[PDB]
Design a binder for this molecule. Structure first.
Ligand code: NAG
Ligand code: NAG
Ligand code: NAG
Ligand code: NAG
Ligand code: NAG
Ligand code: NAG
Ligand code: NAG
Ligand code: NAG
Ligand code: NAG
Ligand code: NAG
Ligand code: NAG
Ligand code: NAG
Ligand code: NAG
Ligand code: NAG
Ligand code: NAG
Ligand code: NGA
Ligand code: NGA
Ligand code: NGA
Ligand code: NGA
Ligand code: CA
Ligand code: CA
Ligand code: CA
Ligand code: CA
Ligand code: CA
Ligand code: CA
Ligand code: CA
Ligand code: CA
Ligand code: CA
Ligand code: CA
Ligand code: CA
Ligand code: CA
Lengths: 833, 400, 258, 130, 129
């Protein structure tokens, strides 16, 4: 739960743990406070909404045969006005009111009503027959009204053919009792599928027969459930094992695990027109598209997405609906998008709390969503223009989590009741229960033919002409269904938008939840490189090796350094010991060496990957934040933030150290080298400036202030362009290295972006003495270090000793240094304190 | 420089002039180039009645029946032999009836002699929410359809299969009625039958707009273009009772036929103008420069709304298409080149002006048509595939 | 300002043309008897047009339609025959004072003022002046500004020439015509081919707004305040003049001339 | 539909109430006794646009405005389009249209300064004079 | 659109004039060198950007140097007329004769001072560095 919700005097938790131990405080400003000790926004105090469960926030400030019972907009059917259960805020709709009122008809004698007259606690009331309304001009006679306007007039369609309304059902349904719509007998009996944890269950529409679809006691929690009817398959997701499973509705010893190595999948949607699966990952902030086998993967939405939790699809129109928190604002919202991810719109942005769970109505073209914070089920139209509430309050819907819709009913799962519930999709003042147990139900879906209507798949013929992947989309002019093309990882769309071109060089960047590779230009291909993710995780340092198709990245959550291959086929750990705070990584491709900096130990460390040999080469630094290496030149560059901040140059082995730049630097940050110009470039995050000099720091130039580089953090240089990232804009920016003002934004909305690097074999070139075939590895034993004038030095691992040739090192590498995590003036202890 | 001097092309000489026909035409007048004849089969006339389209053959003084419809056919335009199979394509508009919206329809018209022996089916472009499509024009270079709707007050462009729809002009329109296109110049011309009638010309991509005539217009109901004699524009008025011609830049205006018996449509072929009389159901022809006297060809059903001339050389097929596949959704001609456009409700992908952010759409291939030549007969197989049976003396596939 | 019109001279065609600021109408106003027109000024209160000719070596006044035409000055301006119309290339008008100002770059360079009705012929600037091609007035200060292409300066004085100051002093290579708005002065330069703006009192802020392949010839600022609103003497009955009505020297009253 | 598809207009002749107003056609439109509707502009212009002639019952003609240069008004208080004025057809039955008073040839402009006069009622530029 | 946040007619892009004020319209991103001048235009052989490659044919012979090399004027047409009271310069300019030989450049390309022989200062004068 979000920390702000904790100790807010309202139970967000299933078991109320967010409020049990809290000590409260008052609230005010542009806010309002009401019964039960709750605080509410100022505008909410008068908007026709029961934001306070006491119904108190509307006291002061409705269809035919209905009455607004309080002095405000709580609107209830005529019977409730006296039926004897307080349906309104404090009675006022009861036989007698504790406030002093009584049900009677005295006013009716005066009124001279044109039609039936009804008893009311306060005064009396008059109403009119179906198709008519009472007129505000005299409150006594009857006028002609368009019954179709009434919310819930018919289950699917309404027509006022002669003022009198008639109800119609679509081609898949049959009509009952003049307003209800039932499903044609040609289709199998409708079924309900829901999960209660370790098991996945199937039940009948009336809730009296239950069975288990897959009884294998070998899996984690079943979180999301979706189905394909024609293929008669059921699909569900497990976040404990990070897996997606599919079964056959018969459950006859057939269970398959999809070929999708996706981190923490949490919600699932199925597309039956294009045979596609849509997956939602909340910890990774990603939405992905795969086929029913998992063998083709596309990244659909990763930018300006925050913890997507609910997803719903309509493939007959090419629409995708999901609920997510804005990464740049952190506000909950419900969005509509095209199934290709190309076009996005926000349908709900007010009074949304925690909008977990979305379902769709395909005959009325409506979206239904669940909110567990404000305790409600609410529906809007695909365009968001009309909003209605099905149930609200902790009594009717205290903690709903999942929702599904069929005919006149909605089925949702509630964690407080630990039950599966049945409600009327229009309005249900007293929901009903369908399944009850002592286990929390997680996902619910309904399985029937009409829930997955048929449409002609534009991709179904010749793959829509797409060379690699075809995804459904929405026709903005006709309103129908169309298509779009997508390329696999390592590919990008050609100018014809149908063929895919292989991408050799790409731009690589790291963030809290992911390490990603994207084209150097404005492109619809969200990811070129197979993404890299973990959880809980925070990736900061990244470097690459292009000769062996490998990338190196560091994680500060686990304090580990990893090497991985851009095709995802490999993952290995370089080191997981004595790393305290790895702030920057750099790689040398001539000697196969990796360098990293630690602000915890205030040191710079070098390691050799051919045999995993490690040494610490610089110590007693202050704030070593950035490092870059130049093997052909025999130089190493490092930056320190301690005042006066400085940039320093050294020999690849650390034998020399000199401050090459030590003036007008606040936060000297990421460092890049330009091999064409033999120049060094750096970014300053305190002064938000870009400066470049030669390797001696003797010539210094500053670029013109980038129009929106409010707070840059990382820099990389490629061809005639400079690429930098902004920590506040959450963006990647492109600039021209000679002046500083050709400006472009390649990506935006990336949460916690940290560093950017450019991946290219053309960049990782050059030669040094270590490389010579006549002197393999520079004839060194354990370390070879390039130094200027094509010279080299042979280093040794930590604790070893050197001999007369000054090239071979012999001794014992068996001892690691102590656990000196504490700084000066502090006594270290066995307990890690 | 004189208006009447020649029917197609003129050349100056020190003390005289010569008239000459353009390629595909021959000269057989007593004076060279004073009149031109066109190669290929003789021209045909297309006559959309209230609920049927009829064909007339000028060479044989003969009548044939081509299409029947359940709704009021308003405008007709054709595309000549787009597939080289010997069957042209016809596009027509039908107005909304009651609650039923209007539509634009596509059909195959054989270039060879054929009639009821070859029943023709209909295809609908699927353009939704059309209300009163009073005008229709075909672009054979760009492969586009252009239409004007008087109730929505819009001019829209689409692909000949209805695959991409864009709105070109929406503002400052009052009952758009007739539209004509010139791909060589990259210009479109249309008439407005509003309270203040007008004649306007724009670029075929909508980026430039100009008004050519705004005076002495009562009801400009028909528009035609002459590409053989410059690029002149001709319009018919059934309230002023006149046929008038202008230069596509508005620098010249003339009255060609006076006391036109309520002209409602225009077509120009072989130095002659062809027009229709609103109520008489009559077809009248004269010389396109207003010379001589007028003659009556047919006394057709009073419902005749338009007369169109059907011939290989009416529209210059040879005109080269400059789009060269660069745009991904729509390519629209303009003077001296082309431009790219996205379907309505779409925009270009950020930073690009040659790519659009909208769903792609499959080309809608039209069904196989009845192709039984030489007066054969067409019958549909059990799988609905067309097949031909030929009369005495003809044999082979179809009726070749 | 009144007609929302622009007036210009064309020396290759030897014509004067007027257009609307919306660019929808273009007309030729004077089409003959122009030998070498060099400077043009327009009067928004009297509804008059003034221009200089460097072949006839004279000053002309007309009505904006180009119909009435009178010659307002000739020969010399000093009763000493040292300063005479030789190379007039500058004109600016002040109706509030009823004066016309012009600059000449003859071997004897000078800036002289005459009255819009042709009276009070006098010389305002006669020393340290060699190649004037610029004369402009600032009405918020009652100041006169001119530039010298030879001495490389921009100088401002009062409407009678008895106070002199330099915004730029010898630092400009080849300055041409000038225009003034608020605290800024704008000028054109022929050797660098630039349009530059500076501070009208000392030039402490200087920038180049545009440079061009061809030499810039004239520069003006358009805003209502560059043609201040004032009462026209000839407004009600054209002063009863049968042909031309011209504001008297000093700006009070009018004169009638054939 | 409001469009005469029968020549006698018998199709629309029995149309039911088309709008609750009791009228058969909307605003910016004109209605006829045959339940056929026509652009208001066509009222009283010498053409029975409504087959039953109801669109130009002569009493209706007095109301429509007619600017003299683009449109013409006839002695019958009926209006005709500009080109019709001398097209050679009695577009209005009173025969005011085509009257010699209107159709007769123009009055040549008087010779101005810089010109010359000819016995022919013609003016010639002074340079051309000899 | 320019980096200065200025809007200029598109034809002006890659034309040799700093129309944007910041030269944004005349830089490598535009690829002025790749441009292929129209038939109605004229070309400058030694085209190094920003020196404009294309010149309107109407401008080629006009008395003013349009190409940086002045090639358009280095063609057949003759030198424009100048008054007898004037001096003429390679810039295609006529200047008052008195200006000749005073060590200040009046013609622009120094033709007003080239080849001059200067008389020494008089006793009533003062001399400057
Ligand atoms: C009552 O009805 C009349 C028409 O009968 C209407 O003009 C008036 O506005 C109505 N008043 C109210 C308060 O609705
Ligand atoms: C029920 O389904 C069958 C088979 O699809 C169909 O033929 C029948 O018309 C349907 N009935 C209704 C009332 O829709
Ligand atoms: C799983 O994916 C890999 C890589 O895409 C592929 O090589 C392999 O064949 C797939 N296996 C199955 C069973 O689809
Ligand atoms: C979809 O199509 C299949 C195959 O034609 C048919 O079996 C099924 O009943 C259809 N379902 C719906 C909802 O139309
Ligand atoms: C700054 O660097 C220069 C050059 O290396 C050095 O001489 C100077 O002592 C340094 N000063 C500080 C305060 O680091
Ligand atoms: C038109 O008639 C001529 C005979 O006059 C004939 O040769 C020609 O084939 C006919 N064309 C069509 C399309 O029927
Ligand atoms: C048709 O167009 C081609 C190519 O533009 C041209 O050569 C030919 O003269 C044109 N013919 C006619 C008849 O317009
Ligand atoms: C000058 O430009 C401004 C702003 O673009 C515009 O308002 C004004 O009309 C223009 N004037 C002329 C004469 O082009
Ligand atoms: C141009 O401006 C003038 C002066 O305001 C005005 O009278 C004229 O109508 C304008 N022309 C157009 C076409 O806007
Ligand atoms: C001109 O002015 C001078 C000034 O001293 C005066 O002495 C002289 O008489 C005047 N006349 C001429 C023509 O020099
Ligand atoms: C002429 O100007 C002078 C100043 O130059 C002034 O003193 C005088 O009053 C003005 N008027 C006349 C009539 O001299
Ligand atoms: C305009 O200014 C730029 C920058 O000073 C210069 O390089 C260019 O040559 C100038 N253009 C002309 C035509 O003088
Ligand atoms: C009644 O007439 C008005 C025009 O006066 C029309 O707009 C309206 O649609 C008609 N009645 C309705 C509401 O149908
Ligand atoms: C212009 O383009 C053509 C190809 O269309 C190319 O061959 C030529 O080299 C280009 N440049 C010039 C100066 O012609
Ligand atoms: C004109 O130019 C041509 C081509 O450069 C040259 O051969 C000829 O001599 C020139 N004629 C004159 C008059 O300079
Ligand atoms: C309660 O909270 C407000 C801020 O909303 C202030 O802290 C104020 O001091 C408090 N007021 C009361 C009544 O305690
Ligand atoms: C630190 O490292 C040393 C040497 O390996 C010992 O393992 C010691 O137990 C460690 N101390 C702590 C607290 O982790
Ligand atoms: C026809 O018109 C009358 C008078 O207005 C009534 O409105 C009647 O209801 C109409 N008839 C129908 C069936 O709409
Ligand atoms: C010329 O026009 C005038 C009116 O402007 C008169 O109609 C006159 O009668 C005409 N001249 C002649 C000679 O008839
Ligand atoms: Ca809480
Ligand atoms: Ca509320
Ligand atoms: Ca009650
Ligand atoms: Ca809750
Ligand atoms: Ca001749
Ligand atoms: Ca002179
Ligand atoms: Ca002098
Ligand atoms: Ca009429
Ligand atoms: Ca007539
Ligand atoms: Ca430029
Ligand atoms: Ca030139
Ligand atoms: Ca000099």
């Amino acid at each position: 739960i979000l920390r702000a919700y904790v100790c807010d005097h309202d139970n967000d938790c299933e078991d109320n743990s967010d409020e049990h131990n809290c000590n409260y405080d008052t609230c005010g400003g542009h806010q309002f406070t009401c019964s039960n000790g709750q605080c509410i926004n100022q505008n909410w105090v008068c908007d026709g909404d029961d934001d306070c469960q006491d119904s108190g926030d509307e006291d002061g400030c409705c269809y035919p045969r209905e009455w607004a019972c309080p002095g405000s907009g709580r609107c209830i059917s005529m019977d409730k006005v006296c039926d004897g259960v307080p349906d309104c805020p404090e009675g006022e709709d009861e036989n007698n009111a504790t406030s002093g009122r009584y049900c009677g008809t005295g006013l009716c004698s005066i009124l001279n009503c044109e039609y039936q007259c009804h008893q009311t606690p306060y005064g009396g009331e008059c109403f009119c027959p179906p198709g008519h309304i009472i007129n505000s001009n005299d409150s006594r006679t009857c006028i002609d009204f368009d019954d179709c306007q009434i919310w819930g007039i018919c289950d699917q369609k309404c027509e006022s053919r002669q003022g009198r309304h008639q109800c119609l059902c679509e081609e898949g349904y049959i009509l009952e009792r003049g307003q209800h719509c039932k499903s044609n007998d040609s289709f199998s009996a409708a079924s309900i599928i829901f999960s209660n944890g370790r098991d996945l269950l199937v039940g009948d529409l009336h809730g009296r027969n239950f069975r288990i679809l897959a009884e294998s006691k070998n899996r984690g929690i079943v979180m999301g459930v979706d189905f394909h009817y024609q293929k008669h398959r059921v699909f569900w997701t497990d976040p404990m094992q990070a897996k997606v499973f599919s079964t056959d509705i018969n459950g006859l010893n057939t269970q398959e695990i999809l070929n999708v190595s996706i981190d923490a999948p949490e919600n699932l949607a199925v597309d039956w027109i294009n045979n596609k699966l849509y997956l939602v990952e909340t910890r990774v902030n990603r939405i992905d598209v795969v086929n029913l086998e998992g063998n083709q993967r596309v990244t659909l939405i990763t930018e300006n997405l925050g913890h997507p939790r609910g997803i719903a699809l309509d493939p007959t129109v090419g629409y995708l609906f999901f609920s997510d928190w804005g990464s740049l604002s952190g506000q909950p919202k419900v969005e509509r998008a095209f199934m290709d991810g190309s076009n996005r719109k926000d349908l709900v942005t007010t009074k949304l709390g925690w909008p977990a769970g979305i379902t769709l109505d395909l005959v009325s073209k409506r979206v239904y969503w669940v909110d567990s914070r404000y305790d409600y089920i609410e529906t809007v139209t695909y365009d968001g223009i009309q909003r209605k509430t099905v149930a609200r309050g902790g009594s009717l819907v205290p903690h709903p989590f999942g929702i599904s819709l069929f005919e006149e009913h909605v089925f949702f799962t509630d964690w407080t009741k630990m039950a599966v519930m049945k409600a009327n999709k229009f309005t249900d003042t007293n929901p009903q229960v369908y399944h009850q147990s002592s286990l929390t139900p997680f996902g619910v879906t309904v399985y029937h033919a009409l829930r997955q209507p048929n449409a002609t798949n534009p991709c179904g013929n010749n793959n829509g002409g797409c060379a690699q992947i075809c995804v459904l989309s929405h026709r903005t002019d006709n309103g129908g269904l169309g298509y779009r093309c997508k390329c696999e990882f390592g590919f990008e769309l050609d100018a014809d938008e149908h063929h895919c071109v292989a991408v050799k060089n790409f731009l690589l960047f790291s963030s809290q939840t992911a390490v990603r590779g994207i084209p150097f230009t404005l492109s619809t291909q969200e990811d070129v490189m197979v993404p890299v993710t973990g959880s809980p995780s925070f990736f900061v340092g990244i470097d690459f090796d292009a000769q062996h198709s490998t990338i190196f990245y560091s994680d500060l959550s686990k304090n580990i350094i990893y090497q991985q291959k851009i095709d995802g086929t490999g993952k290995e750990v370089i080191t997981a010991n004595r790393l305290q705070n790895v702030e920057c990584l750099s790689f040398d491709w001539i000697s196969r060496n990796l360098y990293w900096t630690d602000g915890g130990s205030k040191s710079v460390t070098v390691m050799k990957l051919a045999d995993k040999s490690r040494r610490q080469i610089i110590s007693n630094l202050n704030n070593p934040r950035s490092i870059v290496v130049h093997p052909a030149a025999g130089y190493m560059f490092l930056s320190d933030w301690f005042r006066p901040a400085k940039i320093m140059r050294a020999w690849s082995d650390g034998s020399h150290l000199m401050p090459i730049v030590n003036t007008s630097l606040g936060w000297p940050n990421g460092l890049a080298i330009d091999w064409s110009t033999s120049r060094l470039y750096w970014v300053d995050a305190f002064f938000d400036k870009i400066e470049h000099s030669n390797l001696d720091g003797l010539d210094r130039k500053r670029l013109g202030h980038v129009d929106q580089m409010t707070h840059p953090f990382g820099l990389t240089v490629f061809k005639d362009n400079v690429f930098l990232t902004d920590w506040r804009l959450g963006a990647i920016i492109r600039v021209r290295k000679s002046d500083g003002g050709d400006m472009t934004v390649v990506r935006r909305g990336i949460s916690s972006i940290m560093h950017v690097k450019a991946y290219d074999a053309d960049l990782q070139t050059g030669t040094n003495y270590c490389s010579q075939t006549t002197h393999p590895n520079g004839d060194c034993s354990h370390f070879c270090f390039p130094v200027p004038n094509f010279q080299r030095v042979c280093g040794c691992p930590y604790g070893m000793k050197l001999q007369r040739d000054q090239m071979t090192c012999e001794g014992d590498p068996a001892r690691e240094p102590p656990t000196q995590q504490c700084g000066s003036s502090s006594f270290p202890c066995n307990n890690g304190k | 420089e004189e208006f009447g001097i020649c029917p197609q092309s003129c050349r100056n000489s020190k003390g005289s002039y010569e008239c000459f026909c353009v390629d595909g035409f021959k000269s057989m007048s007593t004076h060279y180039g004073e009149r031109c004849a066109a190669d290929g089969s003789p021209p045909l006339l297309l006559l959309p009645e209230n609920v049927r389209i009829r064909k007339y053959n000028i060479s044989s003084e003969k009548f044939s029946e081509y299409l029947e419809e359940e709704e009021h056919i308003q405008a007709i335009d054709y595309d000549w032999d787009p597939e080289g199979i010997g069957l042209s394509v016809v596009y027509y508009t039908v107005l909304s009836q009651g609650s039923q919206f209007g539509a634009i329809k596509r059909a195959y018209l054989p270039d060879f002699e054929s009639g009821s022996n070859n029943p023709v089916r209909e295809v609908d472009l699927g353009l939704k929410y059309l209300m009163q499509p009073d005008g229709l024009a075909v672009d054979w270079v760009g492969r586009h359809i252009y239409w004007s709707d008087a109730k929505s007050q819009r001019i829209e462009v689409a692909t000949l299969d209805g695959r991409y729809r864009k709105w070109l002009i929406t503002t400052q329109l009052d009952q758009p009625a007739a539209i004509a296109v010139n791909p060589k110049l990259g210009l479109m011309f249309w008439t407005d039958q509003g309270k203040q009638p007008k004649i306007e010309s724009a670029w075929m991509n909508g980026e430039h707009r100009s008004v050519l005539a705004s005076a002495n217009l009562g009801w400009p109901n028909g528009l035609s273009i002459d590409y053989l004699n410059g690029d002149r524009i001709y319009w018919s008025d059934s309230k002023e009772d006149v046929i008038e011609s202008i230069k596509y830049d508005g620098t010249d205006r003339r009255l060609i036929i006076n006391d036109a018996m309520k002209p409602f449509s225009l077509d120009i072929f072989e130095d002659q103008l062809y027009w229709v009389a609103k109520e008489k159901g009559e077809v009248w022809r004269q010389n396109k420069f207003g010379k001589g006297n007028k003659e009556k060809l047919l006394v057709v059903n009073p419902w005749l709304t338009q007369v169109r001339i059907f011939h290989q050389l009416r529209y210059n097929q040879s005109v080269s298409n400059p789009c060269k596949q660069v745009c991904s959704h729509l390519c629209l001609l303009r003077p001296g080149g082309y431009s790219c456009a996205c379907p309505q409700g779409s925009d270009f992908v950020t930073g690009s002006t040659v790519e659009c952010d909208a769903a792609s759409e499959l080309p809608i291939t039209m069904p196989s048509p009845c192709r039984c030549m030489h007066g054969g007969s067409c019958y549909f197989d059990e799988n609905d595939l067309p097949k031909c049976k030929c009369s005495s003396g003809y044999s082979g596939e179809y009726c070749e | 300002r009144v007609e929302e019109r622009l007036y210009w001279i064309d020396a290759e065609k030897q014509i004067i043309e007027r257009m609307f600021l919306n660019k929808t109408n273009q007309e030729t106003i004077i089409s003959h008897r122009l030998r070498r027109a060099e400077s043009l000024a327009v009067d928004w209160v009297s509804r008059k047009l003034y221009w200089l000719d460097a072949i006839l070596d004279c000053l002309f006044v007309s009505d904006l339609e180009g119909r009435q035409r009178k010659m307002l000055a000739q020969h010399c301006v000093d009763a000493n025959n040292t300063f005479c119309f030789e190379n007039p290339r500058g004109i600016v008008l002040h109706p509030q004072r009823g004066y016309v100002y012009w600059a000449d770059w003859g071997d004897h360079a000078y800036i002289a003022r005459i009255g819009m009705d042709g009276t009070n012929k006098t010389v305002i600037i006669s020393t340290k002046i060699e190649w004037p091609n610029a004369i402009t007035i600032d009405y918020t200060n009652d100041l006169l500004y001119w530039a010298d292409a030879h001495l490389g300066y921009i100088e401002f004085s009062d409407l009678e020439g008895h106070h002199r100051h330099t915004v730029y002093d010898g630092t400009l290579p080849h300055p041409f015509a000038l225009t003034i708005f608020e605290d800024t002065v704008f000028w054109t330069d022929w050797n660098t081919r630039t349009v530059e703006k500076g501070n009208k009192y000392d030039g402490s802020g200087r920038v180049v707004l545009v440079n061009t392949t061809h030499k810039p010839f004239d520069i003006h600022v358009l805003h209502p305040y560059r043609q201040p609103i004032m009462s026209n003497p000839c407004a009600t009955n054209n002063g009863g003049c049968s042909h031309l009505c011209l504001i008297k020297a000093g700006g009070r009253g009018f004169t009638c001339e054939c | 539909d409001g469009r005469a598809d029968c020549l006698d207009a018998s199709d629309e002749s029995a149309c039911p109430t088309r709008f609750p107003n009791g009228t058969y056609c909307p605003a910016a439109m004109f209605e006829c006794k045959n339940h056929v509707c026509i652009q208001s502009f066509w009222i009283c212009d010498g053409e029975n646009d409504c087959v039953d002639g109801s669109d130009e019952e002569i009493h209706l003609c007095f109301n429509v405005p007619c600017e003299s240069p683009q449109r013409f008004r006839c002695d019958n208080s009926r209006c005709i389009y500009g080109h019709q004025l001398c097209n050679g057809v009695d577009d209005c039955g009173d025969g005011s249209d085509e009257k010699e008073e209107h159709c007769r040839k123009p009055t040549h402009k008087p010779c101005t300064d810089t010109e010359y006069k000819c016995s022919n009622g013609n003016c010639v530029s002074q340079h051309y004079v000899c | 659109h320019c980096d200065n946040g200025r809007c200029i007619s598109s034809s002006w892009v890659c034309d040799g004039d700093n129309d944007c004020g910041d030269m944004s319209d005349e830089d490598q991103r535009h690829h002025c060198e790749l441009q292929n001048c129209s038939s109605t235009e004229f070309t400058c052989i030694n085209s190094r950007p920003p020196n404009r490659r294309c010149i309107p044919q109407h401008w080629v012979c006009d008395g003013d140097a349009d190409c940086a090399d002045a090639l358009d004027e280095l063609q057949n047409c003759t030198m424009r007329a100048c008054s007898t009271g004037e001096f003429s310069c390679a810039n295609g300019r006529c200047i008052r004769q008195s200006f000749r030989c005073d060590r200040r450049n009046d013609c622009g390309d120094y033709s007003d001072e080239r080849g001059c022989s200067y008389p020494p200062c008089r006793d009533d004068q003062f001399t400057c560095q």
